[PDB]
Chain A
């Protein structure tokens, strides 16, 4: 929507590569970031909240960071079942609402 991330990305299995989302000070700057996963026709699953907090049942192999308006979702230990789209979001005071990016569909090569 109002945020920046690519449609798709690809990498070899078992490797280490992350995905980032570029916001602004009006959105990511003062606000906490979340990340979500969905399989085709399934229930989008919360990945990481605040970029440092794993929900219950999340592999510890995921991390996160926020540098200025840029927020990277740490993705490590690629699995054959890790291919799916990951969504960035953070609170917006601009329209005073919840915003997301277009989504990035990972591919494990």
Chain B
């Protein structure tokens, strides 16, 4: 296979501001209405998040723009999308994006996502092709439009679909879906969430708690990746590709100390970064979200040598 359509497009990455976002539960331990503080990889608040578009119609007629780049993993990765009609399935996470290293291949092929940690050959323009079988009248998914070879495979797993629809809602949800990917200590752990959003595109002020889905033995360093897509074929009209529109959100993680406020039921609402501003670092000293009127001594500063 390896059918490819680069369709490179210009313009600057449209950025955004994650207000309160990307706060997962960094333990299984159940806590109730306490302020807990750890320094771990997170997406720090008020951060620059790139609102990317995998397929982007800018109207004259048609003009679907396939931009989705191979992206470095860096420290850690955050992800968010709406996609009332799913066009997104999984990610290619790896290093060489080729053989010679393992490959993290997440395919949420309906309905049984078959997570794959293997050695593949990923094409220059990988994505999942979808077509119509004509036998049993079912839309299959050609998975080798992503990658040519599948062999040597180290790991395999299956679970209930992370990507999930509800719909019937004519919008007003958009089914905002977030996935956090953190690769440490032999365990690459996946996080998820599903949220209604009524706003046109960008994110609200609410907190999103992400539980760990599976903690898996991965043992590979992933320095780079790209997302996956679901497209199809059309027939004679003045081949068909780029079903609907596609856009998503990406931001990189970073070690930061958060104070975590659990609820009576352990549902974290308020989280606060300590290093965010000189004001945020004092609230980490009192451990409280209420700061009484007065003067408090935040950590010292030093002048540094030129």
Q: Which residues of chain A have a CB within 8 Å of any CB of chain B? A: 49, 54-56
Chain A residues with CB under 8 A of B236: 49, 55-56
Of chain B, the residue at the smallest CB distance from A56 is B238
Chain B interfacial residues counted at CB < 8 A: 2
* A37 to B: closest C-beta gap in Å: 16
The 5 closest A-B pairs by CB, nearest first: A55-B236, A56-B238, A56-B236, A54-B238, A49-B236
* B81 to A: closest C-beta gap in Å: 34
Main secondary structure of the interface of A (DSSP, over half): loop
Complex CA–CA separation, A73 to B236 (angstroms): 20
Number of A-B residue pairs at CB separation under 8 A? 5
Complex CA–CA separation, A34 to B175 (angstroms): 44
Supply 5 A–B pairs (Cβ within 8 Å), ascending by A: A49-B236, A54-B238, A55-B236, A56-B236, A56-B238
Chain B residues with CB under 8 A of A49: 236
Complex CA–CA separation, A54 to B238 (angstroms): 8
Complex CA–CA separation, A55 to B236 (angstroms): 7
Complex CA–CA separation, A27 to B31 (angstroms): 74
Chain A residues with CB under 8 A of B238: 54, 56
* A87 to B: closest C-beta gap in Å: 18
* B244 to A: closest C-beta gap in Å: 23
Of chain B, the residue at the smallest CB distance from A57 is B238
Complex CA–CA separation, A104 to B46 (angstroms): 73
Of chain A, the residue at the smallest CB distance from B236 is A55
Chain B residues with CB under 8 A of A56: 236, 238
Of chain B, the residue at the smallest CB distance from A58 is B238
Chain B residues with CB under 8 A of A54: 238
Complex CA–CA separation, A40 to B238 (angstroms): 28
Taken residue by residue from 160 to 174, chain B's Cβ proximity to chain A (1 for < 8 Å, 0 otherwise) reads as 000000000000000
* B44 to A: closest C-beta gap in Å: 52
Which positions 227-249 of chain B face chain A at CB distance < 8 Å? 236, 238
Complex CA–CA separation, A56 to B236 (angstroms): 8
Complex CA–CA separation, A49 to B238 (angstroms): 12
